């Protein structure tokens, strides 16, 4: 019910899985080394 979209650090592919605190398995490479791909876009001017 709680699905979060996560992005991978090693195979760089995203998987929409449930939010699992004990480990969200990337189905692409069997790795738990993942970030969240639901990163919110904020508008800020930076030079």
Contact between 6 and 37 (Cβ < 8 Å): yes
Residues 3-42 that bind Zn ion (CB under 5 A): 8, 11, 26, 28-29, 31
Q: 17, 2 in Cβ contact below 8 A?
A: no
Q: Work out whether the CA dihedral 35, 8, 32, 5 comes out positive or negative.
A: positive
CB of 47 to Zn ion, least distance (A): 34
Residue at token pair 């790795």: 31
CB-nearer residue toward Zn ion: 30 or 45: 30
Shortest distance, CB of residue 15 to Zn ion, whole angstroms? 8
Residue ranges that bind Zn ion, judged by CB under 5 A: 8, 11, 26, 28-29, 31
């Amino acid at each position: 019910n709680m699905t979060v979209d996560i992005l991978c650090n090693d195979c760089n592919g995203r998987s929409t899985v449930q939010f699992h605190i004990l480990g969200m398995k990337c189905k692409i490479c069997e790795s738990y080394n993942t970030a969240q791909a639901g990163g919110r876009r904020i508008s800020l001017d930076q030079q």
